């Protein structure tokens, strides 16, 4: 029996073109460039799930540095102080206190100074 | 509410019809007809007949006031292309698309 190439091809290519929604010009219309664009988007998203974790830690560290220098501490001294003092609060939580509850941040910065 | 006329498979390239149709889109029908009368393009007479047909449709089929009509919609769609050949140098033939247009005009009160 003959199997004509009916429907499976169109169904597969249309899914890839729909994943390219929002891309510029031919990239959201044409299977060949949409398929490249979608492969490349997935590769970037895979790389950026790792880079996102690095980026947010750099943001938190910069904010902790700013808040700590308002207490005559550098980030490097504060973090050493918190380690010696045995305080396990992570950079995401410290950066959150430094912005939203500076009084609490100052309490921890005191605990740090005491341990140094 | 509104009245449409269409001229299907008019033997004029759509780009050539569109550059004129763009002048009348949104105008009152009286001004639209004047604009077409004084735009020296091959498309102007063709678009005028579609517009006047649309206005007759609005007055006869839908008892609307011809004095109060605006060109609500006007567009040109590609019709089927006649394929022709022009002999060129060195035995080669080059394609010629004798393109056709569908010219739609919708008129409405306001």
């Amino acid at each position: 029996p003959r199997v004509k190439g009916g429907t499976v091809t169109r169904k597969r290519r249309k899914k890839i073109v729909k994943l390219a929604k929002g891309y510029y010009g031919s990239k959201h219309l044409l299977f060949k460039v949409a398929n490249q664009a979608v492969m490349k988007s997935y590769q970037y998203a895979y790389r950026d799930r790792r880079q996102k974790k690095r980026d947010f830690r750099r943001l938190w560290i910069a904010r902790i540095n700013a808040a700590a220098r308002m207490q005559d501490l550098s980030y490097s001294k504060l973090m050493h102080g918190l380690k010696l003092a045995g305080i396990d609060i992570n950079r995401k939580m410290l950066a959150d206190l430094a912005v939203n509850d500076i009084a609490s941040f100052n309490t921890l910065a005191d605990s740090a100074k005491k341990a140094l | 509410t509104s009245a449409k006329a269409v001229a299907k498979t008019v033997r004029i390239a759509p780009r050539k019809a569109r550059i004129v149709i763009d002048l009348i889109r949104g105008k009152q029908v009286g001004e639209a007809i004047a604009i077409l009368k004084y735009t020296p393009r091959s498309a102007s007479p063709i678009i005028e007949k579609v517009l006047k047909s649309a206005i007759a449709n609005a007055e006869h089929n839908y008892d609307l006031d011809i004095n109060n009509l605006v060109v609500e919609e006007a567009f040109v769609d590609e019709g089927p292309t006649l394929k022709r050949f022009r002999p060129r140098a060195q035995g080669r033939a080059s394609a010629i698309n004798k393109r056709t247009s569908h010219i739609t005009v919708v008129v409405s009160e306001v």
Binding site: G25, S26 | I19, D22, L23, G30, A34, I35, Y38, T39
Partner: protein, 53 residues
């Protein structure tokens, strides 16, 4: 000599920003009551709007 790349839709449309007609210079006549080109004779009346023929 030849296009190195096909022209995109956007670029083609930008090029055509200036490919358009201007509205004709026209106005309603008094004697006729219909539109006419300025500095032309009005056929509706059948002569120049001002100077009778």
């Amino acid at each position: 000599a030849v296009p190195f790349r096909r022209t995109s839709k956007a670029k083609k449309r930008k090029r055509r920003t200036h490919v358009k007609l201007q509205l004709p210079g026209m106005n309603e006549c008094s004697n006729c009551g219909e539109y006419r080109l300025s500095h032309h004779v009005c056929p509706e009346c059948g002569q120049y709007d001002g100077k009778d023929v």
